[PDB]
Design a protein around this ligand. Structure first.
Ligand SMILES: [Zn+2]
Length: 111
């Protein structure tokens, strides 16, 4: 009868908003984490581009990855700001090359 909660589909954790479900559009909970201490997201520009990619991938299958977009929450607040969950951004960096080390090596090997 009328709800307003959600359970993390990753491991199953009721909740409503945290670091990804509070300003990202992704539920998750304070258990999956990603940075071991915060899961600090990663700028969408340094997330895919750096991961050797930029669109055409995360929109080719339409995965459960969400992003934020607005003034930065920490110090320094430029005009707009596009960010993408870091954990999910890592799952893709591998799905493509398979590891952030295969990326760093792909850019150091290529010209
Ligand atoms: Zn979870």
């Amino acid at each position: 009868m009328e709800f307003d909660y959600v359970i993390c589909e990753e491991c199953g954790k009721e909740f409503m908003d945290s670091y990804l479900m509070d300003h990202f559009d992704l539920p998750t909970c304070d258990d999956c984490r990603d940075a071991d201490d915060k899961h600090k997201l990663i700028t969408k520009t340094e997330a895919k581009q750096e991961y050797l990619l930029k669109d055409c991938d995360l929109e080719k299958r339409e995965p459960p990855l969400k992003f934020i977009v607005k003034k930065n929450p920490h110090h320094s607040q430029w005009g707009d700001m596009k960010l993408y969950l870091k954990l999910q951004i890592v799952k893709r960096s591998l799905e493509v090359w398979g590891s952030q080390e295969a990326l760093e090596e792909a850019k150091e090997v290529r010209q």
